[PDB]
RNA sequence: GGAGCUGUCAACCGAGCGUGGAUCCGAGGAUUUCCGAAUGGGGAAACCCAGCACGAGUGAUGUCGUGCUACCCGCAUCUGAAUAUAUAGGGUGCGGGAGGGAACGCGGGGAAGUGAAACAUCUCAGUACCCGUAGGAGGAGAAAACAAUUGUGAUUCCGCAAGUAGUGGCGAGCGAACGCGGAACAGGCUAAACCGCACGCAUGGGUAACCGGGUAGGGGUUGUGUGUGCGGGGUUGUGGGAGGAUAUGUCUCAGCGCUACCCGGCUGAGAGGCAGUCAGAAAGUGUCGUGGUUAGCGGAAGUGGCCUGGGAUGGUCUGCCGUAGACGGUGAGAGCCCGGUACGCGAAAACCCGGCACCUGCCUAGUAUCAAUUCCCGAGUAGCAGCGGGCCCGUGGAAUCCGCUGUGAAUCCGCCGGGACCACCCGGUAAGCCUAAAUACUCCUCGAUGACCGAUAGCGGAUUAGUACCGUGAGGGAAUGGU
RNA sequence: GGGUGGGGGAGUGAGAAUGCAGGCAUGAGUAGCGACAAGGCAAGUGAGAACCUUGCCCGCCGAAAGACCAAGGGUUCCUGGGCCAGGCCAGUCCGCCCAGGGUGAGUCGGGACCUAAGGCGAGGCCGACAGGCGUAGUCGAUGGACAACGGGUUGAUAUUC
RNA sequence: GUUGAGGCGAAUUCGGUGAUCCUCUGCUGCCAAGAAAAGCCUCUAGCGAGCACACACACGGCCCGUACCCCAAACCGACA
């Protein structure tokens, strides 16, 4: 019943903007959309064993699409853009 | 992992199985994002064995065949 | 007011009939008076809306 | 249940699982974000912001997880403002309510168009609508009933009576009941007098009662009267009960009403009888059915020849089944190819129903005769009057029934009804309560059915369907099936 | 899936209701193609170019027809594609279609601070019922208080990196 | 200089003119007589044995909005 910080972080964001930020040790994550910056700053420090400088967040509404059964709508996401401390080990995000 | 073999883990041997199956599911969610997971049936299974440990822990704290 | 605070008697409705026998609605309201009632002698008072038929019986004490 | 499976539009792939019993079907459980009566506080419903407690985390603030925190009512407890008695109020702790639902019930409020060939009385119509409030039904219900000399014997529902008697600007229209035939049948508890007891309220102190009654004494005042409780007693129309008197009767043990006895009652248990989830008191705990419901399973008989054809389920010869020739499928009209059908078999568990036990209550002292001496038989009620409502009955000679206002009785020689009223006579006992069945309804579940529809029909909706679209909104509201 | 005969039952017969729905003519290859800033050439791209691209020229706005917010809209933004619908013509183009991507705040605009008009409103008072108003309180900016500037960066964000 | 990127980079002085901005919630005049509350400062009730303060270092700073159009072809007018 007890919590676990791997529930907050969902997936890493895989795009060419996110690829460019990794060179400056800036990691982008899809997080659970009802979580705040301090949870993300405590969870990232506990999972990857690293010191975290700042966490920025952004909500994004889902795209509305056209289908012959009507308009539909994709899910809405929240991104966490995590900057590491000056002199920390890089997050091994496996790719 | 069978339900009949989780009932012999005592009280916190289950709680470490839950803790290391959620890391199992966490690493699988990163392999799908990076395009690096092949057996995509593995995500469905690990969610079930997390759901199965939570059933056994709740049966113990409701008297429904409690015991180590 | 038109409801007794002891027996719950409320108004009855009927008709007002004229000489050309034309019928319109009115109420027969009860005879509701205000009393300042004690419970035991020497006690504090309490404002009630009771009817005169409850006043004429022993339903209140002033 | 038994070999395939990963729901559908709706495919195309990917990656897997399954006789070590998968997918699937039925039941019980676990989880159950946020909104909504929504109820910690706020709010543009699905969002924001806390407090308390216990955990988690941090170098420590930040952070996390699970609980609890609305208002009102009821009960029990604690305090008792102004102010003295106290009360309002406040604290604490258990309970309950709140909202939704298609129709049916009861109670209350209540139109108009329309009809009257105008229109106001009247109609429409106690309809539409609204308010409150239920239940699986509800309401009604156990004669202050009818009837008319014979009688019937609670209520409800149906058919007659009857478009009748009547009522009506006697216009338009409205419209009973007595009785008769049936469906279903059932009746039970209380209040009062008085007797006990308990708490008060007064009084009186050898006036004197009291100490079960009688009787011999004694104690030496809490006795007597009385209000509130609680048991007893009591339940009636042929009037009944109480209080009397007298006969007769007292399950057993124990204790109890100052001392002794003659007797009887109160109490605690024992024995016995009866009744039960009920209207007549109320929850359970086990155990058991030929029981019932929610999955299902078995199930007879043609690979027949020939013809036509892409395909026989057709034609024509043949062989059978039938407690099965229902219906649908299958490449064209199939009892014998498939799912089934007739008929039978089946239940871990949950639910429902019933039996037997546990268990729970109730009863064991009255009865009978005579007496008329008393007391009691539901009160701001009935009756009377004013104003209204409803009865066939539109205020009329207007009874019976209901409301509001005034006035205001009596307890059986009483009171009420029998269509103004009086007299006689007959009938019944108002102002306390509860009560099954016969009747109404179908959002929903299951099984059937049609001289019903077949895509402009049938539901608005066979298709994104209350969707697209229109409207600020309440609202309105489509079109679209077939190789 | 029908025919005939004895019967039974009808949503049983349309040319007219300025009827209703669908399909299609007539007007007719006709009016129109939304301001009175105005386009031209060279080169390109492509099956196709008056309209797309690039370059030069000419013209028009310049208290806007330039640059920013607010309400409102909602992915129309960016990149790669597409070209039978749509755009009053054509279209290789597009606010159109498809796929992916993209919106980073102690200080900016708001809440976690405050109140106005007004709203709701514990208890309450009032009203047959439904309900009316309202005290404490609690919401409610268009106002009050309160801390950031300059530069560079992306194809798409910047007082946010 | 794939004319996309990149690298280097001078001088910057003194005048005039001048706001709708600033000093200024100030000033002068007028009558029609011109929000509240937080906040801030201060007083005391009250609390109170450990406080106040400086320097240094290391930290926490949440929620929603942010693209784009916005005198329009993206908003209200059924239409670019
Ligand atoms: Mg959970
Ligand atoms: Mg930052
Ligand atoms: Mg932000
Ligand atoms: Mg009242
Ligand atoms: Mg009435
Ligand atoms: Mg009328
Ligand atoms: Mg799907
Ligand atoms: Mg099984
Ligand atoms: Mg199942
Ligand atoms: Mg709430
Ligand atoms: Mg609220
Ligand atoms: Mg006091
Ligand atoms: Mg209700
Ligand atoms: Mg009328
Ligand atoms: Mg008329
Ligand atoms: Mg007429
Ligand atoms: Mg009843
Ligand atoms: Mg009869
Ligand atoms: Mg079978
Ligand atoms: Mg053929
Ligand atoms: Mg066939
Ligand atoms: Mg058949
Ligand atoms: Mg068969
Ligand atoms: Mg009586
Ligand atoms: Mg009267
Ligand atoms: Mg009348
Ligand atoms: Mg009266
Ligand atoms: Mg008579
Ligand atoms: Mg009676
Ligand atoms: Mg009753
Ligand atoms: Mg009944
Ligand atoms: Mg039925
Ligand atoms: Mg059916
Ligand atoms: Mg249709
Ligand atoms: Mg709308
Ligand atoms: Mg024919
Ligand atoms: Mg025929
Ligand atoms: Mg015919
Ligand atoms: Mg016809
Ligand atoms: Mg025709
Ligand atoms: Mg026509
Ligand atoms: Mg037409
Ligand atoms: Mg012409
Ligand atoms: Mg022309
Ligand atoms: Mg034009
Ligand atoms: Mg050219
Ligand atoms: Mg010019
Ligand atoms: Mg564009
Ligand atoms: Mg594009
Ligand atoms: Mg085109
Ligand atoms: Mg075109
Ligand atoms: Mg699109
Ligand atoms: Mg209130
Ligand atoms: Mg109010
Ligand atoms: Mg206010
Ligand atoms: Mg506010
Ligand atoms: Mg503002
Ligand atoms: Mg931009
Ligand atoms: Mg100057
Ligand atoms: Mg001045
Ligand atoms: Mg911008
Ligand atoms: Mg427009
Ligand atoms: Zn009264």
PDB file of N, CA and C (backbone and C1' of nucleotides) in Angstrom, chain F residues 48-77:
ATOM      1  P     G F  48       4.612  30.734  29.196  1.00  0.00           P
ATOM      2  O5'   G F  48       6.079  31.326  29.005  1.00  0.00           O
ATOM      3  C5'   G F  48       6.958  30.819  28.008  1.00  0.00           C
ATOM      4  C4'   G F  48       8.155  31.719  27.818  1.00  0.00           C
ATOM      5  C3'   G F  48       9.114  31.814  28.993  1.00  0.00           C
ATOM      6  O3'   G F  48      10.029  30.733  29.055  1.00  0.00           O
ATOM      7  C1'   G F  48       8.612  33.983  28.224  1.00  0.00           C
ATOM      8  P     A F  49      10.323  30.011  30.461  1.00  0.00           P
ATOM      9  O5'   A F  49      11.867  29.629  30.397  1.00  0.00           O
ATOM     10  C5'   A F  49      12.386  28.798  29.361  1.00  0.00           C
ATOM     11  C4'   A F  49      13.795  29.186  28.975  1.00  0.00           C
ATOM     12  C3'   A F  49      14.885  28.844  29.992  1.00  0.00           C
ATOM     13  O3'   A F  49      16.099  28.544  29.307  1.00  0.00           O
ATOM     14  C1'   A F  49      14.805  31.189  29.671  1.00  0.00           C
ATOM     15  P     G F  50      16.308  27.107  28.622  1.00  0.00           P
ATOM     16  O5'   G F  50      15.910  27.334  27.094  1.00  0.00           O
ATOM     17  C5'   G F  50      16.724  28.106  26.223  1.00  0.00           C
ATOM     18  C4'   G F  50      16.287  29.549  26.198  1.00  0.00           C
ATOM     19  C3'   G F  50      16.339  30.256  24.854  1.00  0.00           C
ATOM     20  O3'   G F  50      15.206  29.978  24.050  1.00  0.00           O
ATOM     21  C1'   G F  50      17.315  31.629  26.510  1.00  0.00           C
ATOM     22  P     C F  51      15.227  30.298  22.476  1.00  0.00           P
ATOM     23  O5'   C F  51      14.855  31.839  22.386  1.00  0.00           O
ATOM     24  C5'   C F  51      15.415  32.660  21.379  1.00  0.00           C
ATOM     25  C4'   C F  51      15.548  34.082  21.849  1.00  0.00           C
ATOM     26  C3'   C F  51      16.039  35.072  20.810  1.00  0.00           C
ATOM     27  O3'   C F  51      15.020  35.506  19.931  1.00  0.00           O
ATOM     28  C1'   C F  51      17.249  35.380  22.808  1.00  0.00           C
ATOM     29  P     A F  52      15.240  35.410  18.345  1.00  0.00           P
ATOM     30  O5'   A F  52      15.961  36.780  17.978  1.00  0.00           O
ATOM     31  C5'   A F  52      15.344  38.019  18.285  1.00  0.00           C
ATOM     32  C4'   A F  52      16.362  39.105  18.514  1.00  0.00           C
ATOM     33  C3'   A F  52      17.337  39.356  17.383  1.00  0.00           C
ATOM     34  O3'   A F  52      16.778  40.115  16.328  1.00  0.00           O
ATOM     35  C1'   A F  52      18.511  39.295  19.422  1.00  0.00           C
ATOM     36  P     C F  53      17.038  39.686  14.802  1.00  0.00           P
ATOM     37  O5'   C F  53      18.558  40.085  14.544  1.00  0.00           O
ATOM     38  C5'   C F  53      18.991  41.430  14.681  1.00  0.00           C
ATOM     39  C4'   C F  53      20.494  41.528  14.769  1.00  0.00           C
ATOM     40  C3'   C F  53      21.275  40.957  13.598  1.00  0.00           C
ATOM     41  O3'   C F  53      21.312  41.811  12.472  1.00  0.00           O
ATOM     42  C1'   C F  53      22.269  40.266  15.628  1.00  0.00           C
ATOM     43  P     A F  54      21.519  41.186  11.008  1.00  0.00           P
ATOM     44  O5'   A F  54      23.098  41.029  10.870  1.00  0.00           O
ATOM     45  C5'   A F  54      23.962  42.150  10.967  1.00  0.00           C
ATOM     46  C4'   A F  54      25.406  41.724  11.041  1.00  0.00           C
ATOM     47  C3'   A F  54      25.868  40.757   9.966  1.00  0.00           C
ATOM     48  O3'   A F  54      26.177  41.397   8.742  1.00  0.00           O
ATOM     49  C1'   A F  54      26.633  40.017  12.077  1.00  0.00           C
ATOM     50  P     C F  55      25.940  40.630   7.352  1.00  0.00           P
ATOM     51  O5'   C F  55      27.199  39.663   7.228  1.00  0.00           O
ATOM     52  C5'   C F  55      28.513  40.192   7.169  1.00  0.00           C
ATOM     53  C4'   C F  55      29.553  39.137   7.448  1.00  0.00           C
ATOM     54  C3'   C F  55      29.506  37.907   6.565  1.00  0.00           C
ATOM     55  O3'   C F  55      30.059  38.107   5.280  1.00  0.00           O
ATOM     56  C1'   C F  55      29.758  37.242   8.812  1.00  0.00           C
ATOM     57  P     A F  56      29.351  37.426   4.013  1.00  0.00           P
ATOM     58  O5'   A F  56      29.805  35.904   4.107  1.00  0.00           O
ATOM     59  C5'   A F  56      31.179  35.563   4.045  1.00  0.00           C
ATOM     60  C4'   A F  56      31.426  34.151   4.502  1.00  0.00           C
ATOM     61  C3'   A F  56      30.667  33.066   3.764  1.00  0.00           C
ATOM     62  O3'   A F  56      31.241  32.753   2.509  1.00  0.00           O
ATOM     63  C1'   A F  56      30.563  32.659   6.084  1.00  0.00           C
ATOM     64  P     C F  57      30.309  32.579   1.213  1.00  0.00           P
ATOM     65  O5'   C F  57      29.910  31.038   1.238  1.00  0.00           O
ATOM     66  C5'   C F  57      30.912  30.040   1.330  1.00  0.00           C
ATOM     67  C4'   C F  57      30.407  28.789   2.004  1.00  0.00           C
ATOM     68  C3'   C F  57      29.208  28.116   1.363  1.00  0.00           C
ATOM     69  O3'   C F  57      29.552  27.340   0.232  1.00  0.00           O
ATOM     70  C1'   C F  57      28.898  28.222   3.704  1.00  0.00           C
ATOM     71  P     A F  58      28.541  27.235  -1.010  1.00  0.00           P
ATOM     72  O5'   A F  58      27.418  26.226  -0.503  1.00  0.00           O
ATOM     73  C5'   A F  58      27.756  24.909  -0.097  1.00  0.00           C
ATOM     74  C4'   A F  58      26.621  24.252   0.643  1.00  0.00           C
ATOM     75  C3'   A F  58      25.290  24.240  -0.076  1.00  0.00           C
ATOM     76  O3'   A F  58      25.219  23.225  -1.055  1.00  0.00           O
ATOM     77  C1'   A F  58      24.961  24.888   2.167  1.00  0.00           C
ATOM     78  P     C F  59      24.231  23.382  -2.305  1.00  0.00           P
ATOM     79  O5'   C F  59      22.853  22.808  -1.767  1.00  0.00           O
ATOM     80  C5'   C F  59      21.652  23.534  -1.944  1.00  0.00           C
ATOM     81  C4'   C F  59      20.727  23.349  -0.775  1.00  0.00           C
ATOM     82  C3'   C F  59      19.272  23.662  -1.047  1.00  0.00           C
ATOM     83  O3'   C F  59      18.595  22.610  -1.701  1.00  0.00           O
ATOM     84  C1'   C F  59      19.924  24.713   0.955  1.00  0.00           C
ATOM     85  P     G F  60      17.751  22.902  -3.031  1.00  0.00           P
ATOM     86  O5'   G F  60      16.307  23.278  -2.491  1.00  0.00           O
ATOM     87  C5'   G F  60      15.544  22.324  -1.777  1.00  0.00           C
ATOM     88  C4'   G F  60      14.403  22.967  -1.038  1.00  0.00           C
ATOM     89  C3'   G F  60      13.448  23.786  -1.879  1.00  0.00           C
ATOM     90  O3'   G F  60      12.511  23.008  -2.592  1.00  0.00           O
ATOM     91  C1'   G F  60      14.020  25.008   0.039  1.00  0.00           C
ATOM     92  P     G F  61      12.215  23.350  -4.127  1.00  0.00           P
ATOM     93  O5'   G F  61      11.622  24.827  -4.088  1.00  0.00           O
ATOM     94  C5'   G F  61      10.323  25.049  -3.571  1.00  0.00           C
ATOM     95  C4'   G F  61       9.948  26.509  -3.482  1.00  0.00           C
ATOM     96  C3'   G F  61       9.840  27.287  -4.777  1.00  0.00           C
ATOM     97  O3'   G F  61       8.646  26.992  -5.473  1.00  0.00           O
ATOM     98  C1'   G F  61      10.797  28.627  -3.056  1.00  0.00           C
ATOM     99  P     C F  62       8.686  26.364  -6.945  1.00  0.00           P
ATOM    100  O5'   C F  62       7.469  25.349  -6.958  1.00  0.00           O
ATOM    101  C5'   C F  62       7.525  24.128  -6.245  1.00  0.00           C
ATOM    102  C4'   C F  62       6.166  23.755  -5.720  1.00  0.00           C
ATOM    103  C3'   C F  62       5.020  23.924  -6.695  1.00  0.00           C
ATOM    104  O3'   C F  62       4.905  22.851  -7.609  1.00  0.00           O
ATOM    105  C1'   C F  62       4.426  24.871  -4.617  1.00  0.00           C
ATOM    106  P     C F  63       4.487  23.125  -9.126  1.00  0.00           P
ATOM    107  O5'   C F  63       2.942  23.467  -9.042  1.00  0.00           O
ATOM    108  C5'   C F  63       1.989  22.517  -8.591  1.00  0.00           C
ATOM    109  C4'   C F  63       0.617  23.130  -8.528  1.00  0.00           C
ATOM    110  C3'   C F  63       0.130  23.764  -9.815  1.00  0.00           C
ATOM    111  O3'   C F  63      -0.406  22.823 -10.720  1.00  0.00           O
ATOM    112  C1'   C F  63      -0.225  25.263  -8.036  1.00  0.00           C
ATOM    113  P     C F  64       0.190  22.695 -12.200  1.00  0.00           P
ATOM    114  O5'   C F  64      -0.759  23.590 -13.096  1.00  0.00           O
ATOM    115  C5'   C F  64      -2.164  23.473 -13.006  1.00  0.00           C
ATOM    116  C4'   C F  64      -2.830  24.762 -13.387  1.00  0.00           C
ATOM    117  C3'   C F  64      -2.356  25.395 -14.673  1.00  0.00           C
ATOM    118  O3'   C F  64      -2.888  24.778 -15.826  1.00  0.00           O
ATOM    119  C1'   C F  64      -2.545  27.049 -13.005  1.00  0.00           C
ATOM    120  P     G F  65      -2.019  24.696 -17.169  1.00  0.00           P
ATOM    121  O5'   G F  65      -1.963  26.197 -17.675  1.00  0.00           O
ATOM    122  C5'   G F  65      -3.121  26.876 -18.129  1.00  0.00           C
ATOM    123  C4'   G F  65      -2.797  28.296 -18.502  1.00  0.00           C
ATOM    124  C3'   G F  65      -1.644  28.481 -19.466  1.00  0.00           C
ATOM    125  O3'   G F  65      -2.026  28.268 -20.807  1.00  0.00           O
ATOM    126  C1'   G F  65      -1.466  30.037 -17.697  1.00  0.00           C
ATOM    127  P     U F  66      -1.143  27.340 -21.764  1.00  0.00           P
ATOM    128  O5'   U F  66      -0.101  28.352 -22.398  1.00  0.00           O
ATOM    129  C5'   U F  66      -0.506  29.647 -22.814  1.00  0.00           C
ATOM    130  C4'   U F  66       0.625  30.643 -22.768  1.00  0.00           C
ATOM    131  C3'   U F  66       1.803  30.336 -23.684  1.00  0.00           C
ATOM    132  O3'   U F  66       2.319  31.551 -24.217  1.00  0.00           O
ATOM    133  C1'   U F  66       2.564  30.543 -21.472  1.00  0.00           C
ATOM    134  P     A F  67       2.413  31.770 -25.800  1.00  0.00           P
ATOM    135  O5'   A F  67       2.613  30.310 -26.385  1.00  0.00           O
ATOM    136  C5'   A F  67       3.907  29.762 -26.571  1.00  0.00           C
ATOM    137  C4'   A F  67       3.983  29.012 -27.861  1.00  0.00           C
ATOM    138  C3'   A F  67       3.444  29.747 -29.071  1.00  0.00           C
ATOM    139  O3'   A F  67       4.421  30.605 -29.627  1.00  0.00           O
ATOM    140  C1'   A F  67       2.535  27.577 -28.997  1.00  0.00           C
ATOM    141  P     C F  68       4.093  32.115 -30.046  1.00  0.00           P
ATOM    142  O5'   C F  68       2.872  31.994 -31.056  1.00  0.00           O
ATOM    143  C5'   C F  68       3.063  31.568 -32.394  1.00  0.00           C
ATOM    144  C4'   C F  68       1.758  31.205 -33.051  1.00  0.00           C
ATOM    145  C3'   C F  68       0.764  32.330 -33.241  1.00  0.00           C
ATOM    146  O3'   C F  68       1.075  33.160 -34.341  1.00  0.00           O
ATOM    147  C1'   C F  68      -0.351  30.419 -32.414  1.00  0.00           C
ATOM    148  P     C F  69       1.023  34.748 -34.172  1.00  0.00           P
ATOM    149  O5'   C F  69      -0.460  35.121 -34.590  1.00  0.00           O
ATOM    150  C5'   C F  69      -0.991  34.702 -35.837  1.00  0.00           C
ATOM    151  C4'   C F  69      -2.492  34.803 -35.862  1.00  0.00           C
ATOM    152  C3'   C F  69      -3.080  36.124 -35.413  1.00  0.00           C
ATOM    153  O3'   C F  69      -3.077  37.078 -36.456  1.00  0.00           O
ATOM    154  C1'   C F  69      -4.258  34.325 -34.407  1.00  0.00           C
ATOM    155  P     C F  70      -2.757  38.623 -36.171  1.00  0.00           P
ATOM    156  O5'   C F  70      -3.797  39.033 -35.050  1.00  0.00           O
ATOM    157  C5'   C F  70      -5.007  39.692 -35.377  1.00  0.00           C
ATOM    158  C4'   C F  70      -5.916  39.742 -34.186  1.00  0.00           C
ATOM    159  C3'   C F  70      -5.604  40.808 -33.154  1.00  0.00           C
ATOM    160  O3'   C F  70      -6.157  42.062 -33.487  1.00  0.00           O
ATOM    161  C1'   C F  70      -5.968  38.738 -32.076  1.00  0.00           C
ATOM    162  P     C F  71      -5.234  43.286 -33.939  1.00  0.00           P
ATOM    163  O5'   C F  71      -6.176  44.019 -34.974  1.00  0.00           O
ATOM    164  C5'   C F  71      -7.362  43.374 -35.405  1.00  0.00           C
ATOM    165  C4'   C F  71      -7.969  44.053 -36.596  1.00  0.00           C
ATOM    166  C3'   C F  71      -7.143  45.177 -37.205  1.00  0.00           C
ATOM    167  O3'   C F  71      -7.272  45.146 -38.626  1.00  0.00           O
ATOM    168  C1'   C F  71      -9.253  46.008 -36.516  1.00  0.00           C
ATOM    169  P     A F  72      -6.185  44.360 -39.513  1.00  0.00           P
ATOM    170  O5'   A F  72      -6.540  42.838 -39.299  1.00  0.00           O
ATOM    171  C5'   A F  72      -7.767  42.344 -39.787  1.00  0.00           C
ATOM    172  C4'   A F  72      -7.798  40.849 -39.809  1.00  0.00           C
ATOM    173  C3'   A F  72      -9.048  40.295 -40.466  1.00  0.00           C
ATOM    174  O3'   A F  72      -8.711  39.219 -41.330  1.00  0.00           O
ATOM    175  C1'   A F  72      -8.899  39.524 -38.208  1.00  0.00           C
ATOM    176  P     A F  73      -8.455  39.542 -42.884  1.00  0.00           P
ATOM    177  O5'   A F  73      -8.992  38.255 -43.639  1.00  0.00           O
ATOM    178  C5'   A F  73     -10.340  37.851 -43.497  1.00  0.00           C
ATOM    179  C4'   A F  73     -10.452  36.430 -43.017  1.00  0.00           C
ATOM    180  C3'   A F  73      -9.706  36.104 -41.729  1.00  0.00           C
ATOM    181  O3'   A F  73     -10.496  35.243 -40.923  1.00  0.00           O
ATOM    182  C1'   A F  73      -9.029  34.631 -43.436  1.00  0.00           C
ATOM    183  P     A F  74     -10.637  35.544 -39.360  1.00  0.00           P
ATOM    184  O5'   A F  74     -10.948  34.125 -38.727  1.00  0.00           O
ATOM    185  C5'   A F  74     -10.078  33.023 -38.928  1.00  0.00           C
ATOM    186  C4'   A F  74     -10.042  32.156 -37.702  1.00  0.00           C
ATOM    187  C3'   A F  74     -10.170  32.926 -36.403  1.00  0.00           C
ATOM    188  O3'   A F  74     -10.779  32.092 -35.414  1.00  0.00           O
ATOM    189  C1'   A F  74      -8.034  31.912 -36.518  1.00  0.00           C
ATOM    190  P     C F  75     -12.378  32.000 -35.283  1.00  0.00           P
ATOM    191  O5'   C F  75     -12.741  33.140 -34.249  1.00  0.00           O
ATOM    192  C5'   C F  75     -12.549  32.953 -32.867  1.00  0.00           C
ATOM    193  C4'   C F  75     -13.065  34.132 -32.099  1.00  0.00           C
ATOM    194  C3'   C F  75     -14.476  34.564 -32.433  1.00  0.00           C
ATOM    195  O3'   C F  75     -15.449  33.760 -31.800  1.00  0.00           O
ATOM    196  C1'   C F  75     -13.074  36.459 -32.354  1.00  0.00           C
ATOM    197  P     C F  76     -16.698  33.187 -32.621  1.00  0.00           P
ATOM    198  O5'   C F  76     -17.761  34.359 -32.558  1.00  0.00           O
ATOM    199  C5'   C F  76     -18.340  34.738 -31.326  1.00  0.00           C
ATOM    200  C4'   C F  76     -19.188  35.968 -31.484  1.00  0.00           C
ATOM    201  C3'   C F  76     -20.173  35.955 -32.638  1.00  0.00           C
ATOM    202  O3'   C F  76     -21.342  35.190 -32.405  1.00  0.00           O
ATOM    203  C1'   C F  76     -19.021  37.997 -32.644  1.00  0.00           C
ATOM    204  P     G F  77     -22.064  34.439 -33.625  1.00  0.00           P
ATOM    205  O5'   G F  77     -21.954  35.469 -34.833  1.00  0.00           O
ATOM    206  C5'   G F  77     -22.720  35.315 -36.010  1.00  0.00           C
ATOM    207  C4'   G F  77     -23.107  36.639 -36.614  1.00  0.00           C
ATOM    208  C3'   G F  77     -23.368  36.624 -38.103  1.00  0.00           C
ATOM    209  O3'   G F  77     -24.627  36.086 -38.426  1.00  0.00           O
ATOM    210  C1'   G F  77     -22.024  38.471 -37.586  1.00  0.00           C
TER     211        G F  77
END
